[PDB]
Design a protein around this nucleic acid. Structure first.
Ligand SMILES: [K+]
Ligand SMILES: [K+]
Ligand SMILES: [K+]
Ligand SMILES: [K+]
Ligand SMILES: [K+]
Ligand SMILES: [K+]
Ligand SMILES: [K+]
Ligand SMILES: [K+]
Ligand SMILES: [K+]
Ligand SMILES: [K+]
Ligand SMILES: [K+]
Ligand SMILES: [K+]
Ligand SMILES: [K+]
Ligand SMILES: [K+]
Ligand SMILES: [K+]
Ligand SMILES: [K+]
Ligand SMILES: [K+]
Ligand SMILES: [K+]
Ligand SMILES: [Mg+2]
Ligand SMILES: [Mg+2]
Ligand SMILES: [Mg+2]
Ligand SMILES: [Mg+2]
Ligand SMILES: [Mg+2]
Ligand SMILES: [Mg+2]
Ligand SMILES: [Mg+2]
Ligand SMILES: [Mg+2]
Ligand SMILES: [Mg+2]
Ligand SMILES: [Mg+2]
Ligand SMILES: [Mg+2]
Ligand SMILES: [Mg+2]
Ligand SMILES: [Mg+2]
Ligand SMILES: [Mg+2]
Ligand SMILES: [Mg+2]
Ligand SMILES: [Mg+2]
Ligand SMILES: [Mg+2]
Ligand SMILES: [Mg+2]
Ligand SMILES: [Mg+2]
Ligand SMILES: [Mg+2]
Ligand SMILES: [Mg+2]
Ligand SMILES: [Mg+2]
Ligand SMILES: [Mg+2]
Ligand SMILES: [Mg+2]
Ligand SMILES: [Mg+2]
Ligand SMILES: [Mg+2]
Ligand SMILES: [Mg+2]
Ligand SMILES: [Mg+2]
Ligand SMILES: [Mg+2]
Ligand SMILES: [Mg+2]
Ligand SMILES: [Mg+2]
Ligand SMILES: [Mg+2]
Ligand SMILES: [Mg+2]
Ligand SMILES: [Mg+2]
Ligand SMILES: [Mg+2]
Ligand SMILES: [Mg+2]
Ligand SMILES: [Mg+2]
Ligand SMILES: [Mg+2]
Ligand SMILES: [Mg+2]
Ligand SMILES: [Mg+2]
Ligand SMILES: [Mg+2]
Ligand SMILES: [Mg+2]
Ligand SMILES: [Mg+2]
Ligand SMILES: [Mg+2]
Ligand SMILES: [Mg+2]
Ligand SMILES: [Mg+2]
Ligand SMILES: [Mg+2]
Ligand SMILES: [Mg+2]
Ligand SMILES: [Mg+2]
Ligand SMILES: [Mg+2]
Ligand SMILES: [Mg+2]
Ligand SMILES: [Zn+2]
Lengths: 60, 114, 50
RNA sequence: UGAACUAUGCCUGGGCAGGGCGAAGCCAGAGGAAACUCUGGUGGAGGUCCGUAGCGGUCCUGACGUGCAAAUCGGUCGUC
RNA sequence: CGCCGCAGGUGCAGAUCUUGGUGGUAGUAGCAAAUAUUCAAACGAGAACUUUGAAGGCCGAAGUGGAGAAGGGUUCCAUGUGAACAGCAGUUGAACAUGGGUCAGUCGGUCCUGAGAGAUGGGCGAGCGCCGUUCCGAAGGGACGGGCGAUGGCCUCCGUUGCCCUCGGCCGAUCGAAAGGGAGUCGGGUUCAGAUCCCCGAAUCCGGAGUGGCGGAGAUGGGCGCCGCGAGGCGUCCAGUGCGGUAACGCGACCGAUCCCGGAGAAGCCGGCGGGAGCCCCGGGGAGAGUUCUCUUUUCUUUGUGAAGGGCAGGGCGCCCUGGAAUGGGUUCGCCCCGAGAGAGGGGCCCGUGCCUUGGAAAGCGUCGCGGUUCCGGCGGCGUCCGGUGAGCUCUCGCUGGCCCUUGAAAAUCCGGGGGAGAGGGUGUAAAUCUCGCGCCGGGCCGUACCCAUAUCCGCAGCAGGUCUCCAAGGUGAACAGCCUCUGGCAUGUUGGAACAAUGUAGGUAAGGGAAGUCGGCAAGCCGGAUCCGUAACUUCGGGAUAAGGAUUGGCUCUAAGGGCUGGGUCGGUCGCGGCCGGCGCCUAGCAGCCGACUUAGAACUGGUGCGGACCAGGGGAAUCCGACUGUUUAAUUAAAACAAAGCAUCGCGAAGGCCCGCGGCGGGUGUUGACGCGAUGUGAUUUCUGCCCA
RNA sequence: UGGGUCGGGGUUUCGUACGUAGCAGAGCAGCUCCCUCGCUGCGAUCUAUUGAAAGUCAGCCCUCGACACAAGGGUUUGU
RNA sequence: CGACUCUUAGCGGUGGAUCACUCGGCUCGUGCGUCGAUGAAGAACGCAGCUAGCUGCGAGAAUUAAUGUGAAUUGCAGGACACAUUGAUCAUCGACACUUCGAACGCACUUGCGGCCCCGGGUUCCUCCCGGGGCUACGCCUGUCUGAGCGUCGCU
């Protein structure tokens, strides 16, 4: 789960997460929060685990 | 009795909001949103009330994904004109053209006099 | 309503973030002269412009 | 500057229990010289009748009248 | 601040004076619309109001239930606080504080056009501008087609590029619907709060593929010479843009452009029938509960199969073939149909939401247990069964009618056909091509929480007001009536306790009389449903009419009548205790068995004459005036005799026009019109009349 | 001794309770080695038990039966 | 006796007059007298470690650079900062940058949808998908290119 720029679309979120975390993602679901920020649910590819990626990202 | 609710935000009994009752594997009754009833083509003649046979009655945009056979009949004007009016036009074309020969011959034999 | 445009939703977002109590440390600032957020809005008393 | 209330035209949607009366058309039977007539069914018309929802607002000149309400409430009512 | 001068926005009790503050009134009015609360316990300093349990009630499916649109905008959800606020209180909250929460190719927006809005050309206008929307425009910037070339390069040969030829009117930009049109997502699980969006599993639409992804189709057969016992082989020549059915039309594809034609989109209201489903009801079989003082094989609950395919029922056909009908016949509740082809026989097509099947039982649910993973989509056992009814209710599909001086959208979008410019290959393990099967890739943007109202919207408020919709159980009953109940919900509507004075508000009863009351029967009361009788004057013959008036109505035990399904066989004369043909027989006044709704009529018995026992539920008649009727009207004192109306009469006008708008344009409305039409008046159905006067 | 609360009796209101029994009962349905005229059910209502049952001071009358409770509390008042 | 009521006084409440103050106005005067398609004014949305308003700022967002200055900012925290192999803060401001609407400019907006030319990626060049960059308003002037005319002519 990420907080992203409101002007970024699903394609841009997909590329952004791919290069600066070196992971492959399956799909991106997007909503705009009531506070105005955009939230992205980025589902990783089956061969990637979201737990160790979050561990090395630092959001455990 | 278990009462029902709409599953979409359209809350009015409009022509695009028609539903039918369905029993799920979970043993509950739910609304299933039906599609509009399609119509077979009417004959291109415009003289006979019945709609065409041999052609599936679906909504117009469904015809894009149907095969050719399901949308016509193996005959001249098939899927556009009824068989009866095709027979009438075959006979009418022949007889009128034959009658053109009659008037052509008739003046040919009548022009023998100066 | 549930059906809203992006501009209306963005407008409601800003009105929501600015409807919060003032931070406590503000009163400690020299020459503060601010006691409380006088622009607090409750959804039931006063309605938004739009 | 206003048709977010209201007035009217247009566009596109949605909606209106249960009963009564019984128009045309039709069937059969009967009486007729004919012209035609009578009887029993069938049928289901109508800015039709009783009456819900809805819409309206007659009377109590009822309640209230610093009200629940800057026009509301009860019963009774009109239309359906 | 005094004194000498100077200068004023220089003196308050009033002005229903301005602003601010404070009294008496007064601990007063009041906290009284919609039946209702009680017991115990918990937390807590504190409980009429919070929570849990128990009990008694209410909403009673046209809800006080479950979900939406508009509007609100975080009110949603957890935890905490307890100042203020929630007109008593609160341990509670839509309050306050801190955090959290809205996930989509297939639900909408987006797209289309509607009534309409509106640029540009043009016209007008001092001017900002506004008129106009096809009108006073050189308004097509596109195209597979062909040619000239650049060879840009995997220069074989196909993609590019510039120009030319040819073809080309949405003849009008653009905007305009979260209820119209508009391809395609369903089932299960999951949260404190999200799900048709997340997870799991099943699909599906659109778009793309140049080098072509795989199959299949096109498409691969005949003739003649020879070899070869024959089978089978070689050479040459000729075919081959599929095939079947009399037909309706069928089959998996089934070459084809500009152009043309057509279809779908795409159509009102109402009636009556029929099919299907969901619900309701009835008889059994389970599982779990309830009652058991006596009875009750009893009462209650529950007892699944999505989309998408395939097959089969069922419904419909104004579809075909044979054939030719009066002694007319078929046929509906009604109708209606037939030598322009009835009946009958045999076929074809469409829909198929029903059943079976893949999905599928692995899921779900109900029960009985066993493990723990503080709080496992844990594990396991068993079950998820058989039937019957219907003018039943609700959706849906279909058929057939009725009504209109009313005829009930448009456009995006998709498809079929007609025509045949072309393209394809030389007999190959072939080409062009393919709406057939499978395979590969993608679907961006915005919305999505919650309330949706006797507390989340508007009305100054948690205001008896207002605010658009969907679903809809049992009994009674004509019924979506009223009354009671189940699912679901709530706590009596911004307080409680004690009493039961007057006066009130709301609701009842009252001997005898019966409108004597009053402006006036105002108000109240009488009547009331259904069945059987029986109904006048008058009348526009339709009505009046439920006229008026009278009788009956309960309970129980019966008795008749009103239907549907099957089977009606004379015999081994023989063998496929049963079957092929027949010597072998007369229900033909129809029987035999089984099954099943309500409804009607009659009778007996019976109760203290009570029985539409609550609920529901017309007082009636005789006249006069006005308006014909139905309709409309002063939102907030007048619902009427007022307005309207059909009918009647009159007037203007043939378009260079009548009437009307316009500051202005030869601008605009009637007018997508043309005298059976528009425009302007009066009168006000029907009937009967409408006299005299043009000074 | 007192006044209460129950109970009892009296009064009075309504009208004859539940259960049980009946060869009462319009009738109807089953059993007939049975019965020689019967039995087994359903059945509103009827009869007897039964002027029964139920209520009756809360502002009815009398109790002397039962039970507990009643020399208790607070505030004031002087010629 | 007390209550109650009235008058006066002390004290205490209620209330905010009076007085003193004034980073505000009002008036007069002076010098300048400068907006915008190189996108103005105005609007919207964002930007702080803790930040709602005000203020400042624009994805480089309570500010970068540069220059002057010379040890702070400060509510709290944090970490800088030899002040010379250059520096806190503040001021100035000439470099750079400057989101979306708005004359607002591809078309349209209470929404959304295009077209053209380059670059990168999936392609593994051919054009489909994704991303990035630059263009695509009206009027008008000079010039340019491409054209039209049974306008006037010339030659054939
Ligand atoms: K076909
Ligand atoms: K009727
Ligand atoms: K729409
Ligand atoms: K109608
Ligand atoms: K059962
Ligand atoms: K189980
Ligand atoms: K063709
Ligand atoms: K809503
Ligand atoms: K009292
Ligand atoms: K009187
Ligand atoms: K009427
Ligand atoms: K009236
Ligand atoms: K005119
Ligand atoms: K007149
Ligand atoms: K005269
Ligand atoms: K005259
Ligand atoms: K008895
Ligand atoms: K007795
Ligand atoms: Mg989304
Ligand atoms: Mg729609
Ligand atoms: Mg099914
Ligand atoms: Mg408006
Ligand atoms: Mg309006
Ligand atoms: Mg009527
Ligand atoms: Mg009526
Ligand atoms: Mg009223
Ligand atoms: Mg009054
Ligand atoms: Mg003065
Ligand atoms: Mg004064
Ligand atoms: Mg009081
Ligand atoms: Mg009160
Ligand atoms: Mg009730
Ligand atoms: Mg509700
Ligand atoms: Mg809440
Ligand atoms: Mg309070
Ligand atoms: Mg709050
Ligand atoms: Mg054109
Ligand atoms: Mg549009
Ligand atoms: Mg929810
Ligand atoms: Mg199934
Ligand atoms: Mg026939
Ligand atoms: Mg199972
Ligand atoms: Mg053709
Ligand atoms: Mg929701
Ligand atoms: Mg209210
Ligand atoms: Mg409000
Ligand atoms: Mg207001
Ligand atoms: Mg009450
Ligand atoms: Mg209460
Ligand atoms: Mg309330
Ligand atoms: Mg009396
Ligand atoms: Mg009397
Ligand atoms: Mg009198
Ligand atoms: Mg008198
Ligand atoms: Mg009255
Ligand atoms: Mg009469
Ligand atoms: Mg009787
Ligand atoms: Mg009238
Ligand atoms: Mg008249
Ligand atoms: Mg009115
Ligand atoms: Mg009025
Ligand atoms: Mg009135
Ligand atoms: Mg007349
Ligand atoms: Mg008239
Ligand atoms: Mg006694
Ligand atoms: Mg004082
Ligand atoms: Mg600097
Ligand atoms: Mg739009
Ligand atoms: Mg010339
Ligand atoms: Zn035809």
């Amino acid at each position: 789960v990420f907080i992203v720029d409101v002007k970024a679309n699903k394609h841009q979120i997909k590329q952004a997460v791919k290069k600066l975390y070196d992971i492959d993602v399956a799909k991106v679901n997007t909503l705009i929060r009531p506070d105005g920020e955009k939230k992205a649910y980025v589902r990783l590819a089956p061969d990637y685990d979201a737990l160790d990626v979050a561990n090395k990202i630092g959001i455990i | 009795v278990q009462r029902l609710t709409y599953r979409r935000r359209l809350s009015y009994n409009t022509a695009s909001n028609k539903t039918r009752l369905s029993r799920t594997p979970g043993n509950r009754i739910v609304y299933l949103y039906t599609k509009k009833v399609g119509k077979a083509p009417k004959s291109a003649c415009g003289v006979c009330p019945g709609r065409l046979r041999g052609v599936r009655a679906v909504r117009p945009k469904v015809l894009m994904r149907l095969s050719k056979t399901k949308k016509h009949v193996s005959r001249a004007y098939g899927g556009s004109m009824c068989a009866k009016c095709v027979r009438d036009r075959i006979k009418r074309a022949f007889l009128i053209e034959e009658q053109k020969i009659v008037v052509k011959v008739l003046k040919a034999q009548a022009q023998s006099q100066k | 309503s549930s059906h809203k445009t992006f501009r209306i939703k963005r407008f409601l977002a800003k009105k929501q973030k600015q409807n919060r109590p003032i931070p406590q440390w503000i009163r400690m600032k020299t020459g503060n002269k601010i006691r409380y957020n006088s622009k607090r809005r409750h959804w039931r008393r006063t309605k938004l412009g739009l």
